């Protein structure tokens, strides 16, 4: 009697990926499902990805360490570095509280203010600082690191005198993974990656390719001799067969990009396209680029190079043609604002890059996978 | 609807004002950061705040 990767194991793998961790107290069905196949999941993840699956009494967690960090990966509810700083300081504070210990919001604010490591002090009389603290506490509460004894933190936005009674939950201990050395000896985050891959010298390339495929929306060819892409090219067929066998995804490969598509996305997943209006303009831009191959001839690496002025001209052309159907949010905003918003959206999906030095825009081949248009009857309606 | 349009115009105005205030704030912040960097560089050796 031996275990096999089956519907339950596939479901467990998806649940592991699309959440940070699964809590027994809140996700008993998912926790039970994951645990039953936990042997097979551990085997497969170790052999192919190299991720460490942590199975514990209270939670199950997959330490998703990326190959090359990307903007969309981080905690999205946060919008400024200060939010991350306050989040980390709050964690440091919770290390000082015993399980189920109760502390008031004022104590947490005071400790965060004291520890906050910047040259510029953290001050609660401001609006922005209080808003940052509220976002940090909301993300904390999202992971059930701290429970709320009745009160209201949202009022903290407009009433610094607000008070709340919080409770440190057990999960605070396990939130952050362990680090190789005395972690303080390191000087920059890049040094962490050089460690996490020092443990995976064995078949580093296969784990690299699998992590890039499963994590990132796409995998872009670095140059003509990118080793990851060469690996994918050499083993396209067996990679596709294995991925189809072990998960819902199906592999695609092009001259300048490779990615996994999903046919029936469940509720909890994030996918492109989606409801947000900025995607509509992304699809329209993709179609517009398809329509002038000679003007936007892609270079050998699959990138299309445009300067901010040229991009703004393209966006103006789009506002002229399809703007009638855009969401009212964009219809009312100047060209440069639309350019900024669209470029942020396309950055999240690794569709394009903003060149650090020349401010040149690189539209990656992944954008050309999908194109969108209004129904012809509306477009003729737009003519009326 | 009238109130909505009026508030939308007000919101655009306040957005403009906020952007200019943040421009000034970040200019001053950059200057202050440079000055603190220099002070700490020249004041490094001393056991003094």
């Amino acid at each position: 009697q031996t275990q096999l990767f089956d519907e339950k194991a596939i479901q467990g793998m998806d649940i592991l990926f699309h959440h940070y961790w699964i809590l027994r107290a809140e996700q008993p069905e998912w926790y039970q499902l994951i645990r039953e196949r936990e042997k097979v999941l551990r085997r497969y993840l170790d052999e192919k990805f190299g991720l460490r699956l942590i199975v514990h009494q209270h939670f199950i967690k997959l330490e998703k360490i990326p190959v090359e960090p990307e903007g969309w990966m981080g905690i999205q509810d946060f919008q400024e570095p200060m939010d991350y700083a306050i989040f980390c300081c709050a964690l440091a504070f919770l290390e000082g509280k015993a399980v189920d210990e109760q502390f008031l919001l004022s104590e947490l604010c005071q400790e965060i203010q004291a520890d906050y490591p910047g040259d510029f002090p953290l001050d609660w009389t401001l609006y922005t600082h209080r808003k940052s603290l509220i976002r940090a506490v909301k993300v904390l509460m999202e992971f059930q690191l701290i429970r709320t004894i009745d009160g209201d933190i949202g009022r903290f936005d407009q009433n610094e005198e607000q008070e709340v009674l919080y409770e440190a939950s057990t999960y605070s201990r396990y939130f952050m993974r362990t680090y190789p050395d005395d972690f303080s000896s390191y000087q920059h985050w890049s040094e962490l990656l050089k460690e996490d891959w020092k443990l995976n010298q064995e078949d580093e390339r296969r784990k690299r390719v699998y992590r890039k495929l499963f994590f990132s929306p796409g995998l872009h060819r670095l140059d003509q001799q990118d080793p990851d892409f060469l690996y994918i090219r050499n083993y396209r067929n067996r990679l596709a067969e294995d991925i189809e066998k072990h998960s819902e995804y199906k592999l695609h490969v092009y001259k300048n990009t490779a990615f996994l598509s999903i046919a029936e996305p469940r509720q909890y997943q994030q996918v492109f396209p989606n409801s947000k209006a900025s995607t509509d303009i992304i699809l329209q831009l993709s179609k517009y680029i398809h329509g002038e191959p000679e003007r936007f001839k892609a270079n050998e690496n699959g990138e299309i190079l445009m300067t901010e002025g040229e991009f703004e001209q393209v966006v103006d052309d789009l506002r002229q043609q399809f703007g009638t159907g855009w969401a009212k949010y964009f219809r009312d905003m100047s060209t440069k604002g639309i350019r900024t918003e669209l470029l942020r959206a396309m950055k999240d999906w690794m569709m394009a890059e903003v060149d650090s030095e020349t401010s040149l825009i690189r539209i990656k081949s992944l954008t050309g996978v999908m194109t969108g248009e209004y129904p012809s009857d509306f477009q003729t309606g737009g003519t009326e | 609807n009238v109130q909505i349009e009026k508030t939308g115009h007000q919101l655009e105005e306040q957005k403009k004002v906020l952007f200019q205030l943040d421009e000034q704030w970040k200019q001053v912040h950059g200057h202050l950061q440079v000055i603190k960097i220099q002070l700490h560089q020249e004041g490094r050796q001393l056991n003094l705040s």
Partner: protein, 98 residues
């Protein structure tokens, strides 16, 4: 006693040369000692403190200006966000009314 006073002053001014200069004086201990180098060192230390004092005053001035600007910008952020919440509330109210 003067040596105790001098050590206290070096501690306050963080004059590390005090120890070195004191011992240099002590490795002669009876000669027609030349204080020129010691006086020069304390002069350089005082000049350094003058420069750091000027930088500290400049930093404090810019810090006051920067706090003024930060509070102004945060107040405008509060107003803008209040208006945006009010607009969203009105939009919901208008959909319900329609």
């Amino acid at each position: 006693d003067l040596l105790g006073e001098l050590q206290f002053d070096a501690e306050e001014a963080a004059f590390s040369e005090h120890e070195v200069n004191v011992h240099d004086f002590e490795r002669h201990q009876e000669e027609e000692f030349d204080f020129s180098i010691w006086i020069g060192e304390i002069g350089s230390h005082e000049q350094l403190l003058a420069n750091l004092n000027q930088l500290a005053d400049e930093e404090n001035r810019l810090s006051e200006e920067h706090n003024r600007l930060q509070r102004q910008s945060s107040e405008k952020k509060k107003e803008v966000d209040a208006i945006r919440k009010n607009l969203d509330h009105l939009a919901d109210w208008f959909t319900e009314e329609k």
